[PDB]
Amino acid sequence: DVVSRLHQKYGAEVEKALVRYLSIGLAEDFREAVLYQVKTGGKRLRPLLTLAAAEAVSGQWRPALPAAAIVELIHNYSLIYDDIIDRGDVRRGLPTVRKAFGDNAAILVGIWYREAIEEAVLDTPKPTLFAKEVAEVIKAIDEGERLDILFEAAGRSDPYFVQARWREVTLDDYIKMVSLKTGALIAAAAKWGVLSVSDDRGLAEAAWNFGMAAGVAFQIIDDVLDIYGDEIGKDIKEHKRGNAVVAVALSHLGEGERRRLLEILAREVVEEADVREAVALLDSVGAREEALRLAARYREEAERHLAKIPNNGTLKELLDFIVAREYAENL
Amino acid sequence: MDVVSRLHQKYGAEVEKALVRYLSIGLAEDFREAVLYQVKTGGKRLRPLLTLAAAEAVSGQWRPALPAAAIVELIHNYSLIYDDIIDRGDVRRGLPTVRKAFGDNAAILVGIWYREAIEEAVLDTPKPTLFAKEVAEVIKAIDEGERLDILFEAAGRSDPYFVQARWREVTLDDYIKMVSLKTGALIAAAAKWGVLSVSDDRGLAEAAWNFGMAAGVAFQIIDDVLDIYGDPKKFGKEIGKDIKEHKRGNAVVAVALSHLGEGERRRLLEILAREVVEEADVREAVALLDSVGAREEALRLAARYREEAERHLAKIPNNGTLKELLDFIVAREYAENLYFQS
Numbered sequence: 001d002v003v004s005r006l007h008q009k010y011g012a013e014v015e016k017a018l019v020r021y022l023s024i025g026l027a028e029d030f031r032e033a034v035l036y037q038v039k040t041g042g043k044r045l046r047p048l049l050t051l052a053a054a055e056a057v058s059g060q061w062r063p064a065l066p067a068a069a070i071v072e073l074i075h076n077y078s079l080i081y082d083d084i085i086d087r088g089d090v091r092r093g094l095p096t097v098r099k100a101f102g103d104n105a106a107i108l109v110g111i112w113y114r115e116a117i118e119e120a121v122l123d124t125p126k127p128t129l130f131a132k133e134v135a136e137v138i139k140a141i142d143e144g145e146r147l148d149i150l151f152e153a154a155g156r157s158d159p160y161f162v163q164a165r166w167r168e169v170t171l172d173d174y175i176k177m178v179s180l181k182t183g184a185l186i187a188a189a190a191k192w193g194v195l196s197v198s199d200d201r202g203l204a205e206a207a208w209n210f211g212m213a214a215g216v217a218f219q220i221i222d223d224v225l226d227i228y229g230d231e232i233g234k235d236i237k238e239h240k241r242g243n244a245v246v247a248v249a250l251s252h253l254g255e256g257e258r259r260r261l262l263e264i265l266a267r268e269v270v271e272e273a274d275v276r277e278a279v280a281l282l283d284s285v286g287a288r289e290e291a292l293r294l295a296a297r298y299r300e301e302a303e304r305h306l307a308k309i310p311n312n313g314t315l316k317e318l319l320d321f322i323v324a325r326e327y328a329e330n331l
Numbered sequence: 332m333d334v335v336s337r338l339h340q341k342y343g344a345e346v347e348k349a350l351v352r353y354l355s356i357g358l359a360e361d362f363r364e365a366v367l368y369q370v371k372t373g374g375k376r377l378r379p380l381l382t383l384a385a386a387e388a389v390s391g392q393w394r395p396a397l398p399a400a401a402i403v404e405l406i407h408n409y410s411l412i413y414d415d416i417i418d419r420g421d422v423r424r425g426l427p428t429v430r431k432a433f434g435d436n437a438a439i440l441v442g443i444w445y446r447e448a449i450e451e452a453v454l455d456t457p458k459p460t461l462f463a464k465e466v467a468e469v470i471k472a473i474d475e476g477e478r479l480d481i482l483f484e485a486a487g488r489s490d491p492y493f494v495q496a497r498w499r500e501v502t503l504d505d506y507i508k509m510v511s512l513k514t515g516a517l518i519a520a521a522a523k524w525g526v527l528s529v530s531d532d533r534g535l536a537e538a539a540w541n542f543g544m545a546a547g548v549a550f551q552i553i554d555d556v557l558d559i560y561g562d563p564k565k566f567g568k569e570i571g572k573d574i575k576e577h578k579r580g581n582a583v584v585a586v587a588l589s590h591l592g593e594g595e596r597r598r599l600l601e602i603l604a605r606e607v608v609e610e611a612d613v614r615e616a617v618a619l620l621d622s623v624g625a626r627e628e629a630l631r632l633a634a635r636y637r638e639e640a641e642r643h644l645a646k647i648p649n650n651g652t653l654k655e656l657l658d659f660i661v662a663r664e665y666a667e668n669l670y671f672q673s
């Protein structure tokens with residue numbers, strides 16, 4: 001499989017780069033806490049995409065290593081803060097930073113990550129350009145995260161999350177939110193591959209579009225799982241209207257059913273019977289199959305952009321992996 | 332007509348405008364109030380004033396130093412947003428903190444936003460790649476100083492890392508290292524960045540940095556003296572505040588620990604480690620500090636850095652306003668008011 005193969009090919013050099021940028025100026029008694037997040041594993045799909053994109057358009061991958069490190073560091077920076085925000089105890093089967101070291105320690109670590117990202121930016125072939133792209137993409141992620149949280153129906157005490165809670169969450173709102181929270185960084189992973197080794201603006205734009213559509217399809221599929229399992233109803237227990245199946249259901253359910261699903265989502269604690277009841281409501285408008293169809297739409301869009309990129313065989317394999325093409329179709 | 336009020340009048344409108352411009356790039360209407368809050372709660376803006384006064388001293392112009400002035404003040408506020416989360420601070424500048432008004436998690440989204448606004452400002456400076464590196468270094472310095480400050484505490488934290496990595500001993504050298512990072516570096520940067528914005532003179536840039544660093548260290552030491560002995564005049568400022576907050580990273584405490592005998596050293600540390608430090612514990616701790624004259628030694632240490640700041644400042648042309656700001660920053664009048672006491 002393509003991910004194992006590129007991990008065996010690129011993995012050691014990616015990991016070296018991550019530790020390298022993080023270690024600059026890093027005090028010895030802070031080293032364990034700072035490196036923890038990049039030592040807990042993870043798929044590294046994003047840096048592999050960046051390196052495969054560079055290899056595709058130029059036949060070289062090493063010049064894109066700084067970009068690959070930036071994208072994976074941005075990913076982990078967002079995870080560290082998201083774990084604090086969501087009070088996540090476990091990720092990749094291991095304790096989170098906030099869990100192992102503390103919420104406040106995790107904040108000092110997230111601060112360190114962003115400056116390690118800047119060191120990496122300065123080590124790219126086009127520092128001023130990557131500096132701008134990084135600011136834009138991290139603002140997209142932050143805004144996506146804000147919307148994801150404001151799309152919850154309950155569960156937060158922050159005066160801001162309570163007061164600014166969105167009254168209604170449409171399918172268009174859902175798609176805008178995932179494009180920012182998940183799409184933008186995958187789009188960046190692909191585009192930065194290209195920018196690292198080429199000045200062809202049209203190839204960089206096509207890589208971006210490709211990565212954006214792949215990232216949207218990826219999130220949609222993730223949402224279907226996070227409703228229908230490999231537990232069951234994770235996103236329902238977390239009160240999320242910003243989930244593809246829920247969003248789709250809300251756009252079809254009748255008045256009574258809609259009100260009731262929202263009621264269930266807004267419950268301070270969601271129990272088994274509530275999850276089964278909510279899912280039944282989803283299935284009653286075929287929300288699962290419609291969400292699956294929306295994923296296929298973005299997969300097909302990603303394919304159209306990918307066609308503009310030369311030597312794209314490996315990226316095509318990565319795409320199938322990312323959008324979990326095999327599993328979705330099986331379903 | 333004090334220098335801070337004078338410079339607020341001259342620079343303030345443009346500074347405030349710059350802060351808002353960089354924060355507002357890409358900012359969603361429903362997030363706007365939460366993000367601009369930290370810069371609308373006021374603040375003395377000493378750092379950007381220093382930046383703009385340094386640029387003006389060396390070149391006669393301050394406007395080209397606006398992006399850098401925005402950077403330094405954004406970093407200042409960025410660090411404040413997270414420090415308030417970390418310390419669970421309810422109030423600052425007499426208003427609710429960001430975390431207080433909007434929530435701890437909302438404040439994280441705000442801090443994340445502040446750092447990208449800083450990067451927008453970096454890219455708007457005259458030497459974007461030079462400024463981008465300096466910003467990375469100064470923020471790491473601040474994060475490191477903040478880390479040490481916390482690990483130099485004696486109790487009061489529930490993070491496993493803050494408890495298990497807490498330092499066994501805190502010397503006066505550790506203390507100075509920590510405050511140079513936590514407080515000195517950003518004031519060093521403020522002055523250096525003013526010069527960088529308008530001059531390629533590397534020797535002038537280095538003098539400004541060294542000047543700002545010494546000034547920042549002197550300022551922190553005087554602040555430490557106050558956060559032990561209290562402000563005689565300012566209302567309801569508690570005696571022994573840094574004692575109640577379990578700080579060994581306070582100039583008076585570190586001086587004391589370096590001189591006190593073992594019995595006395597042990598007792599001071601027992602007191603700092605109390606979960607809740609009683610009024611009577613404070614009085615006993617202060618007596619321990621006074622027993623080795625730790626207060627006057629801290630004030631002497633502040634004089635040393637003030638004097639170092641002046642030596643560096645003498646290398647900078649047209650430095651009259653910077654001299655006034657130095658006197659403000661290190662609270663010269665107050666520190667000399669205390670030593671004309673005895």
Ligand code: DMA
Pocket residue numbers: 041042043044045075092181182222
């Ligand atoms: C927004 C989102 C789905 C984050 C998880 O990404 P991932 O599946 O790439 O996680 P990991 O880094 O653990 O592979």
Ligand code: DMA
Pocket residue numbers: 078079082083086088141145181182
């Ligand atoms: C951008 C980012 C870090 C998203 C994580 O979102 P989440 O909390 O919905 O996902 P997870 O369940 O992986 O924490």
Ligand code: DMA
Pocket residue numbers: 373374375376377407424513514
């Ligand atoms: C870390 C540190 C020494 C902060 C000083 O705050 P300040 O006196 O500059 O506060 P403000 O920004 O409110 O004027």
Ligand code: DMA
Pocket residue numbers: 410411414418420473477513514
């Ligand atoms: C770098 C930074 C923002 C330090 C804050 O210092 P502190 O928590 O010791 O005091 P305060 O919260 O009053 O600034």
Ligand SMILES: [Mg+2]
Pocket residue numbers: 082083086088
């Ligand atoms: Mg999460």
Ligand SMILES: [Mg+2]
Pocket residue numbers: 082086148
């Ligand atoms: Mg989340």
Ligand SMILES: [Mg+2]
Pocket residue numbers: 222223226
């Ligand atoms: Mg999910």
Ligand SMILES: [Mg+2]
Pocket residue numbers: 414415418420
């Ligand atoms: Mg504080």
Ligand SMILES: [Mg+2]
Pocket residue numbers: 414417418
């Ligand atoms: Mg603090």
Ligand SMILES: [Mg+2]
Pocket residue numbers: 554555558
């Ligand atoms: Mg103090």
